Amino acid sequence: EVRDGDILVGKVTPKGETELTPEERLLRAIFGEKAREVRDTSLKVPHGE
Amino acid sequence: TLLQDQLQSVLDTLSEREAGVVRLRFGLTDGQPRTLDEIGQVYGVTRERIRQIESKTMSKLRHPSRSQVLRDYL
């Protein structure tokens, strides 16, 4: 049983090779987690459904 | 922008040295990542002195009272 905003299909695409702000890159060192070189673009449910 | 403001409010509460080490290191006040000897060059210190104060600073940053307001900012 879903509500609106839930995730339907796990979809993910590569980003490429970009640069970051130094401030967020600092925080990623603070939280010790680089994510990946991909994009978080998955299938989710439309609203009121 | 408010994220950068929280960077200011949290980052100004630590010591005088570590502010300049992190800012001049990570390219924050200027915008460019630098080598090891560049920010130790203005201080007249060694690379290991920078690395122990910076690494101990990274131990200070994982103190969770600071991390609580910053976890959602991921």
UniProtKB/TrEMBL annotation, chain A:
It comes from the Bacteria. This is DNA-directed RNA polymerase subunit beta. The chain holds residues 789 to 837 of 1172 of the full protein. DNA-dependent RNA polymerase catalyzes the transcription of DNA into RNA using the four ribonucleoside triphosphates as substrates. Belongs to the RNA polymerase beta chain family. It comes from Mycobacterium tuberculosis. The RNAP catalytic core consists of 2 alpha, 1 beta, 1 beta' and 1 omega subunit. When a sigma factor is associated with the core the holoenzyme is formed, which can initiate transcription.
From TrEMBL, chain B:
Residues 35-61 form the RNA polymerase sigma-70 domain. It comes from Mycobacterium tuberculosis. It is found in: Cytoplasm. This is RNA polymerase sigma factor SigA. Interacts transiently with the RNA polymerase catalytic core. Signal peptide: none annotated. Belongs to the sigma-70 factor family. RpoD/SigA subfamily. Residues 10-63 are annotated as: Sigma-70 factor domain-4. Sigma factors are initiation factors that promote the attachment of RNA polymerase to specific initiation sites and are then released. This sigma factor is the primary sigma factor during exponential growth. Residues 36-55 bind DNA. The gene is sigA.
